[PDB]
């Protein structure tokens, strides 16, 4: 079993953890936009179909 509602908030409010969670959300969005740009790279660099 885990740590109770109030006791968690006595630790997880510390600037170290807040900086960490801010960095994690931001680098997650950067990573996902990195996938998105990566996908466009693959799509543009790959050859189109042989036409009919």
């Amino acid at each position: 079993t885990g740590l109770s509602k109030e006791e968690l908030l006595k630790v997880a409010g510390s600037p170290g953890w807040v900086r960490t969670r801010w960095a994690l959300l931001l680098l997650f969005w950067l990573g996902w936009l990195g996938m998105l740009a990566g996908a466009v790279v693959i799509i543009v660099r790959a050859p189109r179909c042989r036409e009919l």
Binding site: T1, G2, L3, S4, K5, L8, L9, V11, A12, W17, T20, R21, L24, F28, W32, M35, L36, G38, A39, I42, I43, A46, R48, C49, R50, E51, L52
Partner: protein, 454 residues
């Protein structure tokens, strides 16, 4: 600090019409024709599995108003058959069935979204895997950020796929405006046709997994199922009719993606609308699945089976962030996989196995605890009819795939080591317990999450 009730009737309808309609109606309707070899027969095969699924769904309106615990058929199983049967379901749902169906549907989004950029030839494999993951990540981010957002996205794409189906239907009517042959009489043909139809409608039982976030279950849940499945059945019958206004039997059976082949024939220029909307049809389905997935595993940790980290809600956002992370990660791991689609084939029966066990359990419950409130009761025999019909359409699945279900029944035994180690062991290894605790508090700090006020 508890999961707040937010799902209005429209959002429940959007979930269930969202997750039922699928890709099937656009790119695998030929699954009926191949066995039901006449178009005049194919339309009645769809109606038959329509009404069969409806009586199944009524039985789940009964289960979901008689037992309100909101696990879906996991909690329904547990309330009758107890701990280990329900766990052997939930272990397969966690490891296999929920993730691998998500990943497959995400890949169907990726393929049919990218199709117009590659009309005549297979889409770049290296891109498709990536665009699947982009979708599964984004919809996890939305459902992690807000339930109101999650349900607004589901509303939007449940609309978007009906909008697509309306275009297909009306183009059929236009074609008729311009203006039983060959039927297979054989039981050994038509029974496999009917089974091949239920792979389309599968998805109706998914609304039961959110009875705890439904606004007024006793009114809204039976109503959402009455509102949705007739609309679905009608749309299926009309959409498959629309294809028969345009294409021959042979032409459909050899077509790769029948909505796109129809879409080219009618639209010509701008036909790429149909590939795109086939994509959007799947974009909605993944959302509906991720939502539902996260709530299953959240009841899994409530019942003490799964590690209690998954119970920890976000206190300001009221979203089950750890469960959504778990759902997403287990989905993305299927992006590694080789020759994937037939790995799932041996679990295709298992959905019906659980539905059968659940309705048998509801009938046992009707005599072991006869005094319960039951705001909905159906006719005594309607479940018995449906169980019998379901057991018949289970039995064909083994006959169709006997060595593969040899792997299917082997893999469910994965749960027995896990149950004795996790559920049952009575916490002997103290040096591991302090590590479980350490990992748990780390996750709580790292995600800012806390137990459910109950």
């Amino acid at each position: 600090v508890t999961l707040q009730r937010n799902i209005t009737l429209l959002n429940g309808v959007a979930i269930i019409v969202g997750t039922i309609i699928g890709s099937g109606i656009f790119v695998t309707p030929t699954g009926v024709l191949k066995e039901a070899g006449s178009p005049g027969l194919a339309l009645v095969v769809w109606a038959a599995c329509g009404v069969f699924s409806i009586v199944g769904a009524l039985c789940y309106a009964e289960l979901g108003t008689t037992i309100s615990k909101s696990g879906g058929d996991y909690a329904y199983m547990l309330e009758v058959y107890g701990s280990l049967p329900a766990f052997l379901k939930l272990w397969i749902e966690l490891l296999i069935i929920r993730p691998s169906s998500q990943y497959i549907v995400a890949l169907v989004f990726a393929t049919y979204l990218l199709k117009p950029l590659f009309p005549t030839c297979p889409v770049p494999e290296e891109a498709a895997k990536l665009v699947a993951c982009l979708c599964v990540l984004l919809l996890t981010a939305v459902n992690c950020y807000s339930v109101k957002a999650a349900t607004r996205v589901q509303d939007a794409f449940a609309a978007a796929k009906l909008l697509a189906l309306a275009l297909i239907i009306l183009l059929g009517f236009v074609q008729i405006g311009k203006g039983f042959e060959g039927t297979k009489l054989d039981v050994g043909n038509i029974v496999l046709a009917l089974y091949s139809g239920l792979f389309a409608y599968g998805g109706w039982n998914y609304l039961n997994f959110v009875t705890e976030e439904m606004i007024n279950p006793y009114r809204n849940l039976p109503l959402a199922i009455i509102i949705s499945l007739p609309i679905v059945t009608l749309v299926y019958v009309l959409t498959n009719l629309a294809y028969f206004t345009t294409l021959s039997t042979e032409q459909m059976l050899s077509s790769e993606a029948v909505a796109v082949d129809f879409g080219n024939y009618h639209l010509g220029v701008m036909s790429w609308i149909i590939p795109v909307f086939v994509g959007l049809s799947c974009f909605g389905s993944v959302n509906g699945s991720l939502f539902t997935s996260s709530r299953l595993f959240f009841v899994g940790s409530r019942e003490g089976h799964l590690p209690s980290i998954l119970s920890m809600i976000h206190p300001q956002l009221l979203t089950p962030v750890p469960s959504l992370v778990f759902t997403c990660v287990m989905t993305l791991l299927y992006a590694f996989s080789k020759d994937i689609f037939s790995v799932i084939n041996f679990f295709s029966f298992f959905n019906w196995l659980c539905v059968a066990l659940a309705i048998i359990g509801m009938i046992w419950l009707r005599h072991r605890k006869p005094e319960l409130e039951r705001p909905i009761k159906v006719n005594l025999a309607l479940p018995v009819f449906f169980i019998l019909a379901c057991l018949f359409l289970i039995a064909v699945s083994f006959w169709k795939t006997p060595v593969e279900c040899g792997i299917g029944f082997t893999i469910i035994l994965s749960g027995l080591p896990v149950y004795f180690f996790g559920v049952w062991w009575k916490n002997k290894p103290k040096w591991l317990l302090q590590g479980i605790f350490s990992t748990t508090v780390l996750c709580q700090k790292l995600m800012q999450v806390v137990p459910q006020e109950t």
